[PDB]
Design an enzyme around this catalytic site. Structure first.
Site: not given
Ligand SMILES: O=C(O)c1cc(C(F)(F)F)ccc1N[C@@H]1CCc2[nH]c3ccccc3c2C1
Ligand SMILES: O=C(O)c1cc(C(F)(F)F)ccc1N[C@@H]1CCc2[nH]c3ccccc3c2C1
Length: 281
Positions: A70, A116, A119
């Site tokens: 998505e 992993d 941000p």
């Protein structure tokens, strides 16, 4: 593939924003570069959590694995950069941390590690939600395929062969600190510089605080011995509830580091809400 139109690169492989030619659905298409791998990945299509990106399709063809996800319009890194002159408001920091812990609690309960977290590609939408994405799962599955080390847990850097779920809590702690201060907590430029940046802030670990550290594969007795710094220097002006939670997320010993489930119960979240971010798309 010719199955998708308006293919636009947006970031194991390249990621494109694409439109499905038949349905008009806008998606994110990851192009990478195994029966167990295909079946393990495909199991994830049927798992569902509000704080994990939805996996829509898995396609092994040519020398390629396509993952269709998505599409969300922005990530936390872009939002952090956009918010650097004012800072993200504490209620929104808290909502994002809480949601990311909910997502991790879910994937850890299915014995899946992210490995992993960073941000980048932590995905956000206008409704206040944040979602785990861009998992480092190719190696853990049977998938044959410059690196940011800033969010890597110290046991990974010391060459531990068997990561636990605690590696993701470490990474999220580093992200939490960076949301608060607007600077990366441990911005290392190599594996040893990453390790030594951690050591200079949290102290060089020893057998007292981390039983077994001196037997880790890449541990060296020649490591310098730095004393642990004043923790109040680390994330000012975060309050003692926030600093307490962070310290538990950054424990050296993976066995002492707080779990996602227990972190959700920490007093820091007593007053949590779900604010709406100001997003420019
Ligand atoms: O949307 C997804 O599913 C998605 C998935 C992955 C992965 F495959 F790695 F999981 C990676 C990134 C994803 N989205 C981008 C997040 C950040 C960003 N910044 C932009 C700026 C201009 C236009 C578009 C964008 C996007 C979309
Ligand atoms: O994110 C990626 O790139 C990615 C890559 C690979 C591959 F092995 F192929 F590299 C495999 C999975 C990937 N992500 C999934 C997104 C959807 C989802 N739902 C979950 C529910 C519980 C636990 C985990 C999950 C995941 C992770």
């Amino acid at each position: 593939m010719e199955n998708f139109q308006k293919v636009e690169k947006i970031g194991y492989g390249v990621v494109y924003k694409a439109r499905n030619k038949l349905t008009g659905e806008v998606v994110a298409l990851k192009k990478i570069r195994p029966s167990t791998a295909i079946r393990e990945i495909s199991l994830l299509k049927e798992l569902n959590h509000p704080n994990i990106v939805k996996l829509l399709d898995v396609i092994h063809t040519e020398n390629k694995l396509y993952l269709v996800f998505e599409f969300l319009h922005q990530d936390l890194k872009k939002f952090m950069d956009a918010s650097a002159l004012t800072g993200i408001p504490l209620p929104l920091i808290k909502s994002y941390l809480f949601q990311l812990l909910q997502g991790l609690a879910f994937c850890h309960s299915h014995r899946v590690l992210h490995r992993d977290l960073k941000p980048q590609n932590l995905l956000i939408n206008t409704e206040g939600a944040i979602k785990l994405a861009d998992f480092g799962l190719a190696r853990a599955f049977g998938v044959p395929v410059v690196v940011t080390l800033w969010y890597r847990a110290p046991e990974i850097l010391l060459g531990c062969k068997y990561y636990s779920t605690a590696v993701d809590i470490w990474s999220l702690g580093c992200i939490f600190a960076e949301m608060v201060t607007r600077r990366a907590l441990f911005p290392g430029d190599s594996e040893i510089d990453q390790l030594f940046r951690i050591f200079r802030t949290l102290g060089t670990p020893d057998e007292v605080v981390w039983p077994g550290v001196t037997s880790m594969p890449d541990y060296k007795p020649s490591f310098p011995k730095w004393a642990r710094q004043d923790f109040s220097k680390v994330v000012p002006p975060l309050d003692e509830d926030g600093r307490s939670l962070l310290s538990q997320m950054l424990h050296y010993d993976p066995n002492k580091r707080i779990s996602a489930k227990a972190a959700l119960a920490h007093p820091f979240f007593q007053d949590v809400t779900k604010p709406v971010p100001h997003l420019r798309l």
